[PDB]
Design a protein around this ligand. Structure first.
Ligand SMILES: [Cl-]
Ligand SMILES: [Zn+2]
Length: 361
């Protein structure tokens, strides 16, 4: 097509929320810029470019929003991938230094590795005033209508568009709120021994340092994550937490206690991975408190025994732990933790079964 446009194939490649993994680090940015004001017939100034690290044609919109008399500017992005950590930091700085510019960002996909520094950069960009949302049907259709040379072809949505948009919206909310949804928590941490539909695994985590004779909490370091799925390799939540750990830059000469609240107790493979990790990280004492014992087709008891042998403290979550994670990691907005029926009974039964497991029976 014409210069400065994308063809249907480039759109289908970049602006799509199906499990396309990632791989080709192509980040396509469509941008609109409008003069802020009451005009309803205002002229929208549009541009678009794929990310290229030599000349960066995607940032040419910045020249459009320089200070000019009393003018203010509203910028809109339709970006194929969430902005990287450094670009998010830079745009936060820019919004701070250019209060005459405001910015909305619609995103097609989120990077699966929502690691701590990236999440803090995204929350930084949000606090600077940016509006970040996941693209749904309206945004995809608008981007097709405005930035694609289609030759009379109407926008054709793919099958699982809305479901993927909703899942990405939930993840983005988990990131920006720094807390998980109340329905999500209430469901994933239900401690009935045998359950259906718990396809995900949620892992909350806290860190403490030994100062004087006291475990002091490092509130700057608490957090939560979930597993990665789809079939693009599925990485369990325990492995993702192990990946989070090195970002903390712990002092190898200090003593730390690391607590994991998991909805599913670790599978055999994850248990061996965490045993190997703690046997090579002497400065870290691992506590594992699980809502449910994931039997892992009968391989889990051996893994839990291995992990306990390596020094980890494996326990079953009680009402106190559920209430604690509700207060600490759930967007409750003041609401108290409302326990489900049979919580205590399921908890004490699971404690008995874990006891039988650890003593080898
Ligand atoms: Cl697992
Ligand atoms: Zn696992």
């Amino acid at each position: 097509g014409p210069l400065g446009s994308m063809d249907p194939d480039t759109f289908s490649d970049n602006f799509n929320n199906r499990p396309i993994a990632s791989r080709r680090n192509t980040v396509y940015l469509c941008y609109e810029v409008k003069t802020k004001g009451p005009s309803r017939d205002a002229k929208i100034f549009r541009g678009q470019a794929a990310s290229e690290d030599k000349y960066h044609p995607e940032m040419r919109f910045l020249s459009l929003v320089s200070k000019w008399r009393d003018q203010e500017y509203e910028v809109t992005w339709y970006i194929s991938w969430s902005p990287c950590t450094k670009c998010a930091r830079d745009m936060a700085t820019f919004l701070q230094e250019n209060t005459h510019v405001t910015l909305t960002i619609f995103v097609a996909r989120l990077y699966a590795a929502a690691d701590p520094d990236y999440q803090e950069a995204l929350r930084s960009l949000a606090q600077a005033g940016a509006t970040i949302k996941i693209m749904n049907y309206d945004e995809f259709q608008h981007c097709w209508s405005k930035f694609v040379y289609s030759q009379g072809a109407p926008f054709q949505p793919w099958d699982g568009l809305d479901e993927h948009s909703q899942a990405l919206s939930g993840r983005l909310g988990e990131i920006l709120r720094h807390s998980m949804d109340a329905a999500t928590f209430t469901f994933n941490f239900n401690n009935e021994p045998w359950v259906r539909g718990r396809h995900e695994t949620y892992l909350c985590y806290e860190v403490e340092r030994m100062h004087n004779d006291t475990w002091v909490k490092l509130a700057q370091r608490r957090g939560f994550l979930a597993n990665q799925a789809k079939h693009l390799e599925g990485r369990h939540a325990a492995l993702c937490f192990l990946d989070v750990i090195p970002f903390w830059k712990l002092d190898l000469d200090q003593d730390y206690r690391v607590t994991c609240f998991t909805s599913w107790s670790p599978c055999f493979s994850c248990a061996q991975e965490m045993a190997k990790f703690i046997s090579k990280n002497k400065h870290v004492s691992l506590c594992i408190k699980t809502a449910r014992i994931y039997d892992d087709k009968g391989r889990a008891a051996e893994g839990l025994r291995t992990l306990a042998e390596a020094g980890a403290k494996i326990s079953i979550m009680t009402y106190s732990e559920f209430k604690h994670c509700w207060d600490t990691f759930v967007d409750h907005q003041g609401a108290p933790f409302q326990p489900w029926d049979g919580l205590d009974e399921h908890s004490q039964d699971l404690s008995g079964r874990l006891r039988a497991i650890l003593q080898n029976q």
